[PDB]
A paper describes a structure:
We crystallized and determined the structure of RocC both alone and in complex with RocRSL3 containing a modified stem-loop with a nine base-pair stem and a tetraloop (RocR9bp-tet) at 3.2 Å. The asymmetric unit contains six copies of apo-RocC14-126 and four copies of the protein–RNA complex. Overall, the hairpin-tail RNA binds to one side of the ProQ/FinO domain, largely through interactions between the protein and the RNA backbone. The hairpin portion of the RNA is bound by the N-terminal portion of α5 with supplementary interactions from α2. The N-terminus of this helix hydrogen bonds to all four non-bridging oxygens in two successive phosphate groups—C21 and C22. The 4-nucleotide single-stranded 3’ tail (5’-U25U26C27U28−3’) adopts a hook-like structure. The 3’ terminal nucleotide, U28 bends back such that its 3’-hydroxyl hydrogen bonds with the penultimate phosphate linking U26 and C27. The terminal U28 is bound within a well-conserved and structurally rigid pocket that is formed between α5 and a β-turn at the N-terminus of α4. The pocket contains Tyr87 and Arg97, which are both among the most highly conserved residues in the ProQ/FinO domain family and together recognize the phosphate of U28. However, how FinO could at once bind to a hairpin RNA while destabilizing its base pairing was unclear. The RocC/RocR structure reveals that RocC only binds the 3’ strand of the hairpin, leaving the 5’ side unencumbered so that it could be peeled away to allow duplexing with a complementary RNA.
Residue numbers in the entry: 14 to 124
RNA sequence: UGGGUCAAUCUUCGGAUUGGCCCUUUCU
């Protein structure tokens, strides 16, 4: 049971690393972190076949975006009227006042 | 966030827990 939980963490690394390698404008946090389009998960799962070719499952792509968006740095960039971007960095929407408040609320809760 | 399914351990045998995969959920 000790190792069965480690393989899930590594399977989630591989999942998030695959996202950062194929869609860097959104998930390569070395360059920058920016708000993601609402419904980006649907756009990502349209590439589920290309990700399966390297071992990354649909459920693990979901588990990776969850990890990516619960980081404090992601919640910290959810500021009112910051641009949400698609998988290629293109502007598609803006962050609403409610969404910006809920984020700063989650940040305060943590820590 | 909920649901299905397979595998492992356990059970006071009513069940419970961990993990894989699929569907699904305002801030993805």
């Amino acid at each position: 049971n000790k190792a069965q939980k480690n393989q899930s963490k590594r399977a989630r690394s591989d999942a998030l690393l695959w996202l950062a390698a194929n869609f860097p404008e959104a998930f390569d946090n070395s360059l920058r972190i920016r708000p993601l389009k609402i419904g980006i998960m649907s756009d990502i799962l349209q590439h589920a076949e290309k990700a399966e070719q390297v071992g990354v499952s649909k459920s693990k792509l979901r588990e990776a975006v969850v990890l990516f968006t619960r980081r404090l740095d992601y919640l910290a960039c959810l500021k009112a009227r910051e641009v949400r971007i698609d998988l290629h960095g293109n502007p598609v929407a803006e962050v609403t006042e409610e969404e910006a408040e809920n984020a700063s609320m989650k940040i305060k809760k943590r820590v």
